[model samples]
Target: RRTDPMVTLSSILESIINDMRDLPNTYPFHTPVNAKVVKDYYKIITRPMDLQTLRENVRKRLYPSREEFREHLELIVKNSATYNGPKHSLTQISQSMLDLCDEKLKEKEDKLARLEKAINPLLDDDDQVAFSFILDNIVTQKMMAVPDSWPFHHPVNKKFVPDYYKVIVNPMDLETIRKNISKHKYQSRESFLDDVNLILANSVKYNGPESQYTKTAQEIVNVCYQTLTEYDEHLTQLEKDICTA
Candidate 1:
């Protein structure tokens, strides 16, 4: 759904990259600085970044967060200014590109803030507690961050797997769980976990026990269990407090 912030941010990065590509004097920035031609390039710029690499990274969904993606963009500008003097045309181009990125990223932040505020009033104190914990939980974040988790990020595509719904009556995904959390639909941590487990279970059922989807699902499930074990005591205590009070 368009509600997925990562999807929105990715598109924003994609648009910015496309715009950068269209700008003049960007050819040098498109690919890596050839160290053979410029022998001292690597010495000056230890971490070389380029638009082509950034585009590929975006396509691969390598950047887990917007901040990481911004760092890469900033590196490109910094590297250019370091190698070429600030007055050089190439440095100026890179600076302008970075400025464009900041402008677009800020616009995204503003939109997210407005959307969040609009929904903030709907949550109660208890709901807020559960919402924050699940949203900010290390295990939850790790699950979402893993590359293997990509297959289960969104609902299974009906076009690609027409028989999926027929086989699995109740579909669950990380994005759906995220939306549920934002809506405060989960009254308890158990319910939240049920949804997460369902995503893994559904993958195994539909894709076979030996399938790569199932393998990835199992890997994520292991990570979730291992990571969440450290928080079990705290979570149990919090649950009792929320439920009793």
Candidate 2:
């Protein structure tokens, strides 16, 4: 039976099931499944975001707002990495992400009760691959149980740190957007140390006590003026730099 080569699992599974090769392999050994749970410091917060993961998944896009993030995600799907890739219904990606999360979570549990409950009704389907996979390795198959504290449960787009934090955006927006966004109104917090300057710059405090952005009532107007002014200034300086060269 041909199967895609798995780098880390094959070596470990070969040792555990070396004698059972006479029976065709059904459940692929997932090596990192166990190791990943113990990775306490894998990402931000030093733990999982249970509030976000257990009840339901949350949208995890890296923009200032949901609308902007959706726009960015759409653009990525249009130009995705593979052929005929990723074009689908609105909730398709979200469902796929949840399925992946469920599969990963199942690998850590040592009990078969949940597995039996799921697969017991399908014991007689000759053409059912899912049922075949369940019953064939029912003895070795088990559900995964992870500690609620693991970060795998938490969704993430960017890795986080305290003293400093990173903001991701199109590289082209770096200087123009970074410097011109008024940061003078922002107050430094002695405890929170790092609150991604971009969030603070456009947020309530920097805007003013009255929540006025740039002391103007119209955020759209301010944003358009700021973006155009900064962009033109960038081109003007670039032209001068070219002349000097």
Candidate 3:
């Protein structure tokens, strides 16, 4: 059929032995024949024969199917090289550290989710209150009580305090104004802020500036900022630890 070069028992066994010489002792031989005997048997032999007669007469013990023959070789190879000894070897320690950091990252994300849940109501505003004002509202107006367990409760100067408020309130304020003002209408932060201030002031005026609702809204804004800031700080610490590891 011209499907392959005419192969003989001598040529097949010689080629198999040569291939085995390049591999490790743990790799299995498909046939049960001894390596040295196979080589010596083929050494004095020469001349190709019909492929069918070669397999049927001399190599009769070989697997009838080529695919199944390869599988028997694989099964013995899997058994010969077995795992042994402790994984705590020095070669494994570096990977262990990275694995630890990954675990820590999961814990950090879980904690952040809890904090986010506590601050959920704070983010639902359509006004553009200054973060400074939100911080002041938390301290002065008496909104929702921030839990002392949060990092924001740790004391800092007024300027540092405002940033926690900014993170929470700024995004909501920006989003509220952007929806009211078309995308191309305001090109700069100053122009956008100008519109935001006007809208927020009008909203407050309509609802009664001194009412309980205004105080409550600003109070939530500061707490939301505090919750998100602490969560972000925890995430950053984990990332740094991973990088160092």
Best by TM-score: 1
Of 2 and 3, the candidate ahead on TM-score is 3
Evaluated at residue 241, the lDDT of candidate 2 is 43
Query: Each candidate: how many clashes?
Result: 0, 6, 0
- Tell me each candidate's TM-score: 0.50, 0.15, 0.19
Q: State the weakest 10-residue window (summed lDDT) of model 3.
A: 123-132
Arranged by lDDT with the best first, the candidates are: 1, 3, 2
Model 2, residue pairs in steric clash: 106-144, 108-144, 108-145, 109-143, 109-144, 109-145
Misplaced by over 4 Å in model 3 are 1-200, 227-245
Ranking by TM-score: 1, 3, 2
* Residue-by-residue lDDT tens digits, candidate 1, 30-107: 888888887789888889999889988977877655667889988988887788877888888998888887777787
Best by lDDT: 1
Across residues 1-245, which tens digit of lDDT does each residue of candidate 3 receive?
54221233224433433443333331223233243854442333232222233224324545422223334333333222221113433213322322332444355554433333333323212112222223333333332253332222222234745653433333224334434333334332344346434433433553467855345444444454554355455434433443453
State model 3's lDDT. 0.35
What lDDT does the true structure give each of the candidates?
0.73, 0.28, 0.35
